[PDB]
Design a protein around this ligand. Structure first.
Ligand SMILES: NC(=O)c1ccc[n+]([C@@H]2O[C@H](COP(=O)([O-])OP(=O)(O)OC[C@H]3O[C@@H](n4cnc5c(N)ncnc54)[C@H](OP(=O)(O)O)[C@@H]3O)[C@@H](O)[C@H]2O)c1
Ligand SMILES: O=C(O)COc1cc(F)ccc1C(=O)NCc1nc2ccccc2s1
Length: 316
């Protein structure tokens, strides 16, 4: 298991990164410092997570300490839905750069394929609770992302939560200049994504798996939801390998040629989650884990389901 995967822009991306959604601003600086100390070289960020400044403090301190060189880090962020408008994309990227204390991003993603009305509110709603769309389309937003590459603000661009028809739309964009390097999507044994993954990989697009542990700290969790970390079938595979269930859940996408970005602010877990390069799941383990698919999503917000570009109506 090599540590980095080659992207279609010629750069190499670490297959294990640290997630930062829900990482409290008073804890995430130390979390990222610990992560870098124990070997992480890829951090997954987003403006909408409201903690980029604090993530940036950690990155900058480790650069200043000369624990790691900037060239050895792979920092990812994402353009929020309220910034899809052409004239807002660069400023959104620059705000993220300023908060992260970087002069470039390794990868910048369209966070969701849905544009929302610009403003201070991340989820602008009408009086009945429906998200208010913007009249932007994914193709023009993509052209705006391409400009960021051409101004040196980002080394690679990509997409997130795009279904295969939406990926196809970009691949078929008139005058397409840069193909997406990555599609970052939810993926775990309850949402295995065989079709979308094969499609993306067949086009040379690297897939990143988010919520690989099933996001047990998601704020909308319900008692009746399935629970990966507590699934006796997955625990059994972990026991066989003398690893934790979380370690199995992280190793699983790695063996599908995916990048994976588990989140933690707990130092012991940050370290545990990185110790996944010293064992191998069997082909049988892999197919067995795949067999647990439920088409169950952590991320699929009801208020956005009428947006014309809502991604999860399509089969894949
Ligand atoms: N592109 C998108 O739309 C999108 C959507 C969702 C997520 N993401 C990215 O993917 C990252 C990961 O997904 P996620 O945050 O939803 O959830 P996740 O990584 O599946 O799970 C995080 C949860 O698992 C716990 N945890 C971590 N390591 C553990 C271990 N070894 N043993 C037991 N529990 C453990 C964490 O607790 P503690 O932190 O308390 O240790 C936290 O409650 C996000 O942080 C974000 O960077 C992107
Ligand atoms: O979107 C993420 O990366 C993680 O989820 C969130 C993070 C935040 F900081 C704030 C909100 C969310 C959240 O509600 N995410 C669930 C979402 N589902 C859809 C569906 C269509 C369009 C946009 C969204 S956002």
């Amino acid at each position: 298991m090599a540590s980095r995967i080659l992207l279609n822009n010629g750069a190499k991306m670490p297959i294990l990164g640290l997630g930062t959604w829900k990482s409290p601003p008073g804890q995430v600086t130390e979390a990222v410092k610990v992560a870098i100390d124990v070997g992480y070289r890829h951090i997954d960020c987003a403006h909408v997570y409201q903690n980029e400044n604090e993530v940036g403090v950690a990155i900058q301190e480790k650069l200043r300490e000369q624990v790691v060189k900037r060239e050895e880090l792979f920092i990812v962020s994402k353009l929020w839905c309220t910034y899809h408008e052409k004239g807002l994309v660069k400023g959104a990227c620059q705000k993220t750069l300023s908060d992260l204390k970087l002069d470039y991003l390794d990868l910048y993603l369209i966070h969701w394929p849905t544009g929302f009305k610009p403003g201070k509110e991340f989820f602008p709603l009408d009086e009945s609770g429906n998200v208010v769309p913007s009249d932007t389309n994914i193709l023009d937003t993509w052209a705006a992302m391409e400009e960021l590459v051409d101004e040196g603000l980002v080394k690679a661009i990509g997409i997130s939560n795009f279904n295969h028809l939406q990926v196809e739309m970009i691949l078929n964009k008139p005058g397409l200049k840069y193909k997406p390097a990555v599609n970052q999507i939810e993926c775990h044994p309850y949402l295995t994504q065989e079709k979308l993954i094969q499609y993306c990989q067949s086009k040379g697009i690297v897939v990143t798996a988010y919520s690989p542990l099933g996001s047990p700290d998601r704020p909308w969790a319900k008692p009746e939801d399935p629970s990966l970390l507590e699934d006796p079938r997955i625990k059994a595979i972990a026991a066989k390998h003398n690893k934790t269930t979380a370690q199995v859940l992280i190793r699983f996408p790695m063996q599908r040629n995916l990048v994976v970005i588990p989140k933690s602010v707990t130092p012991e877990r940050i370290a545990e989650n990185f110790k996944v390069f010293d064992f191998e799941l069997s082909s049988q383990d892999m197919t067995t884990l795949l067999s647990y698919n439920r088409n169950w999503r952590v991320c699929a917000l009801l208020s956005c389901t009428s947006h014309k570009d809502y991604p999860f109506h399509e089969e894949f």
